[PDB]
Design a protein around this ligand. Structure first.
Ligand SMILES: *[C@@H]1O[C@H](CO)[C@@H](O[C@@H]2O[C@H](CO)[C@@H](O[C@@H]3O[C@H](CO[C@H]4O[C@H](CO)[C@@H](O)[C@H](O)[C@@H]4O)[C@@H](O)[C@H](O[C@H]4O[C@H](CO[C@@H]5O[C@H](CO)[C@@H](O)[C@H](O)[C@@H]5O)[C@@H](O)[C@H](O)[C@@H]4O)[C@@H]3O)[C@H](O)[C@H]2NC(C)=O)[C@H](O)[C@H]1NC(C)=O
Ligand SMILES: CC(=O)N[C@@H]1[C@@H](O)[C@H](O)[C@@H](CO)O[C@H]1O
Ligand SMILES: CC(=O)N[C@@H]1[C@@H](O)[C@H](O)[C@@H](CO)O[C@H]1O
Ligand SMILES: [Zn+2]
Length: 598
């Protein structure tokens, strides 16, 4: 009888979820030890325990067939069983899974161990991406120096792992097909529980794309005035090494040379943070303060005891790209961040604490539900707070922004600064997964893999390498997430929905009213708002217990992912920028790049 079996199934799930949490704890501890301290021994430990968990997952997926779960009355039970059928990489045969783990750790460790020689001192070769190289890329205005560090990094972080990346693509594809997905693209897209998700994103992107073109055109115009026409052409793609970021993903670091009104204030609180004696500990304490001020959960003692919030001063290798960790017990959550005292890093702290808050909010859920409504939701949480932290309103409250006059021109400066991070990022994020999807789907021949990457970067972002590349180079893995096998569409989703969350949180806080000039969206601070916090609690506590539109509905009553909010935020900028580009006869669009030889 199905009635009797469904009762037994509920008991089966309750026990299994608890077992899965406990087994995942062990894997997470080994992964933590490796990420904090990269050694051959720790790699072996991490990968052996993962292989053990994978074997158990196989048994679980096999055991689900003993239950007639598709026939059950409970949508909740059926959802849990469905989650258990999805094996991912664990679907691979024992030997193939072990090889993939070896391949993945080889790529991540390569990225983490990259060291380059100093541009001025060829005998000093201990410059790592974080913080040495990134500091130069963000601060230097010497185009030849920038080009040097670009080439050195991409050669070492990208090209060096071509063979490993090829095997990764093969095994990822094999895994996807064993789960009966067409490719790893479909496997990744399954996390969004919507068969029209790609088209939805194409539609939203197409709406925002014209604004991006205007920003691109204006930045190119301003860069020409700084570097001269020998470095930057009017009609070509922007040389990417000039954009203040190794991957040209966000351009805020060059705001001082491209700001609409250079004689008016531009928010850069890094210097005032240092003057006031800010430390990584203080920054995390301030993040904790922001969450608690919204009536959300305080960081547990385990977080303070076990987190790594500064780059270790011994000679050891580690993954410095910031991460948050859920150990699937009670209150055992951690962050690993090589944090520096800068404005950008203050946002990163809040970003990572957003993940931690999500962990704490759903820790009461059964194991399979202890994850985000979709991957984009998890990435969005901290960014909503970062948007308010970034406002002149908030920065003045914490004494980091002094003698600031918020006139029309200063507002345009701030909107443009935000756009250099939020709008600029959209085509970048889309191309990261458009690229990997095309490889996963077998749409690009191996002989064309590198120029296929740069073709997308050209088509969507209108940027190009500083030097001519070819199929002898392999540049994609020079981006952390590509070497680390981290799906990237989550960030495109995040950057869209975070404005939906921000707008609604601001309205709930009484901080935004479209008909009130005194309450603009771009100066909303949700600090101290219990009303905004309540919306977060209602959504985050759900975890993955319901499809993501139900989680969005819990927040603000909406069920649709929409670009309306992000466009609303930047509308005052759009109006000004379109007019400024016409006034200055600014060329919009770009010719096809010549920087990748087929
Ligand atoms: C991805 O898709 C794959 C298909 O492309 C899929 O692989 C299939 O999984 C099926 C299991 O659901 C499996 O079906 C079984 O087939 C057995 C015989 O197959 C052999 O010969 C085939 C050639 O004809 C070969 O290709 C195979 O390699 C095999 O050598 C059958 O013996 C078996 O049957 C038994 O089970 C059914 C199922 O019963 C169900 O559950 C209850 C039980 O209480 C029933 O009441 C209910 O009605 C329901 O039917 C019983 O009905 C029956 O009495 C037997 O006990 C079964 O049909 C199939 O072989 C396999 N491969 C192929 C090529 O089809 C993967 O599972 C998919 N992967 C994922 C992750 O989803
Ligand atoms: C700082 C630190 O924790 N270092 C550890 C070290 O103690 C250990 O010997 C090694 C084993 O591979 O892993 C690393
Ligand atoms: C001032 C305020 O609204 N405080 C809320 C309280 O009403 C609510 O009961 C609690 C539950 O988490 O969260 C907090
Ligand atoms: Zn994140």
């Amino acid at each position: 009888a199905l009635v009797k079996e469904e009762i037994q199934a509920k008991e089966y799930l309750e026990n299994l979820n608890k077992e899965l949490a406990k087994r995942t704890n062990v894997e997470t501890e080994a992964a933590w030890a490796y990420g904090s301290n990269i050694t051959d021994e720790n790699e072996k430990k991490k990968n052996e325990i993962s292989a053990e968990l994978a074997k158990f997952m196989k048994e679980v997926a096999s055991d689900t067939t003993k239950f007639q779960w598709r026939s059950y009355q409970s949508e909740d039970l059926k959802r849990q069983f469905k989650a258990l059928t999805k094996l991912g990489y664990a679907a691979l045969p024992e030997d193939d899974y072990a090889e993939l783990l070896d391949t993945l750790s080889a790529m991540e460790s390569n990225f983490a161990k990259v060291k380059v020689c100093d541009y001025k001192d060829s005998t000093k070769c201990d410059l790592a991406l974080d913080p040495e190289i990134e500091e130069v890329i963000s601060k230097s205005r010497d185009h030849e120096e920038l080009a040097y560090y670009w080439r050195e990094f991409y050669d070492k972080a990208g090209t060096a792992v071509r063979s490993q990346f090829e095997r990764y693509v093969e095994l990822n594809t094999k895994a996807a097909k064993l789960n009966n997905f067409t490719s790893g693209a479909e496997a990744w897209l399954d996390e969004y529980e919507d068969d029209t998700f790609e088209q939805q994103l194409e539609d939203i992107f197409a709406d925002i794309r014209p604004l991006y073109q205007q920003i691109h055109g204006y930045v190119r115009f301003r860069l020409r005035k700084h570097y001269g026409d020998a470095v930057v052409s009017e009609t070509g793609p922007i040389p990417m090494h000039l954009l203040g970021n190794m991957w040209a993903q966000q351009w805020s670091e060059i705001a001082d040379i491209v700001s609409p009104f250079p004689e008016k204030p531009l928010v850069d609180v890094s210097a005032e943070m240092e003057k006031q004696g800010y430390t990584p500990l203080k920054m995390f304490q301030m993040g904790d303060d922001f969450f608690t001020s919204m009536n959300l959960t305080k960081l547990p003692q385990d977080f303070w005891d076990k987190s790594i919030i500064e780059k270790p001063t011994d000679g050891r290798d580690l993954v410095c790209h910031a991460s948050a960790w859920d150990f699937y017990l009670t209150d055992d959550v951690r962050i690993k961040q090589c944090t520096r005292v800068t404005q950008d890093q203050l946002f990163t702290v809040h970003h990572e604490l957003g993940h931690i808050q999500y962990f704490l909010q759903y820790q009461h859920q059964p194991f399979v539900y202890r994850t985000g409504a979709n991957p984009g939701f998890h990435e969005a949480v901290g960014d909503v707070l970062s948007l308010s932290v970034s406002t002149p309103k908030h920065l003045e409250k914490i004494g980091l922004l002094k003698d600031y006059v918020r006139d029309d021109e200063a507002r345009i400066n701030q909107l443009f600064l935000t756009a250099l991070d939020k709008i600029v990022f959209l085509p970048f994020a889309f191309t990261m997964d458009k690229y990997r999807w095309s490889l996963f789907r077998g749409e690009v021949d191996k002989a064309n893999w590198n120029c296929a990457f740069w073709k997308l970067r050209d088509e969507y972002s209108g940027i190009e390498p500083p030097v001519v590349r070819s199929e002898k180079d392999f540049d994609a893995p020079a981006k952390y997430h590509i070497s680390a096998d981290v799906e990237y569409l989550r960030y495109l989703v995040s950057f869209i929905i975070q404005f939906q969350f921000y707008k609604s949180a601001c309205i709930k806080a009484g901080q935004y009213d479209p008909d009130n000039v005194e309450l603009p969206l771009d100066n909303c601070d949700i600090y101290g708002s219990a009303a905004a916090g309540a919306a977060f609690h209602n959504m985050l506590s759900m975890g993955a217990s319901k499809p993501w539109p139900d989680a969005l509905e819990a927040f603000n009553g909406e069920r649709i992912m929409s670009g309306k909010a992000i466009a609303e935020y930047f509308e005052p900028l759009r109006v000004w920028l379109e007019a400024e580009n016409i006034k200055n006869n600014v060329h919009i669009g770009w010719t096809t790049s010549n920087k990748c030889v087929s």
